[PDB]
Amino acid sequence: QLTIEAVPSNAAEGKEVLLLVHNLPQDPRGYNWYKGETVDANRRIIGYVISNQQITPGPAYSNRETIYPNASLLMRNVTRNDTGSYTLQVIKLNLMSEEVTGQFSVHC
Amino acid sequence: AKLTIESTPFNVAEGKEVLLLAHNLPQNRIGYSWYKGERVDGNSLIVGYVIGTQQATPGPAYSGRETIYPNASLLIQNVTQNDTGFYTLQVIKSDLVNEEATGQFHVY
Numbered sequence: 001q002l003t004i005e006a007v008p009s010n011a012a013e014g015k016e017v018l019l020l021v022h023n024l025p026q027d028p029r030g031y032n033w034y035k036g037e038t039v040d041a042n043r044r045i046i047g048y049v050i051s052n053q054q055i056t057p058g059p060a061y062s063n064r065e066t067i068y069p070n071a072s073l074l075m076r077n078v079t080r081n082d083t084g085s086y087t088l089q090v091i092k093l094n095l096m097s098e099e100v101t102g103q104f105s106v107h108c
Numbered sequence: 109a110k111l112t113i114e115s116t117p118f119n120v121a122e123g124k125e126v127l128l129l130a131h132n133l134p135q136n137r138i139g140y141s142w143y144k145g146e147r148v149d150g151n152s153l154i155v156g157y158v159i160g161t162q163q164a165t166p167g168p169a170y171s172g173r174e175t176i177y178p179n180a181s182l183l184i185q186n187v188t189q190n191d192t193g194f195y196t197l198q199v200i201k202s203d204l205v206n207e208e209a210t211g212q213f214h215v216y
């Protein structure tokens with residue numbers, strides 16, 4: 001199954017968390033990351049379209065986030081307010097999709 | 109001008125049918141997914157649709173009574189007491205900056 005690992009899962013304030021994604025499906029078209037536990041356009045952090053490497057900052061972007069291809073999300077410069085859930089939607093080539101969440105915490 | 113769902117009729121006799129209309133579809137659309145309930149959740153997927161290939165793909169909530177159309181309308185036939193509730197449409201777009209709307213009807 002599709003999975004997310006916050007590296008580290010408990011991070012000191014001002015450092016960085018990487019959300020690693022395991023078991024991506026084989027046929028991805030692109031990805032969106034969301035703040036919270038569900039897919040909601042109003043809480044979209046960032047996305048990526050593989051065919052043209054288009055990055056798509058959304059309303060929850062804070063100028064700290066980087067989406068790689070593989071779907072991994074790097075958030076630099078974390079604050080106590082970044083503690084919470086993060087949800088990935090992977091849109092496949094056939095436009096079917098998969099969702100996974102997504103947690104980390106931040107101290108100091 | 110946001111994506112919005114309209115049911116016709118809202119109040120449906122058992123055994124009759126309901127049509128869920130989508131207003132203000134984005135130009136950029138390439139596909140659709142209709143979900144049972146209030147959110148995008150692959151486990152509640154009724155049916156996905158690719159506009160260009162006119163492929164409908166049933167999800168786990170598909171019950172043999174639901175039809176999707178190229179304007180994203182969802183027709184549900186032969187309704188039961190169990191169908192009362194919410195239905196959520198996601199419109200997938202070529203930039204994957206997707207839009208969602210919900211979606212309600214009631215069976216007496």
Ligand code: NI
Pocket residue numbers: 130131132
């Ligand atoms: Ni209309």
Ligand code: NI
Pocket residue numbers: 214215216
């Ligand atoms: Ni009732």
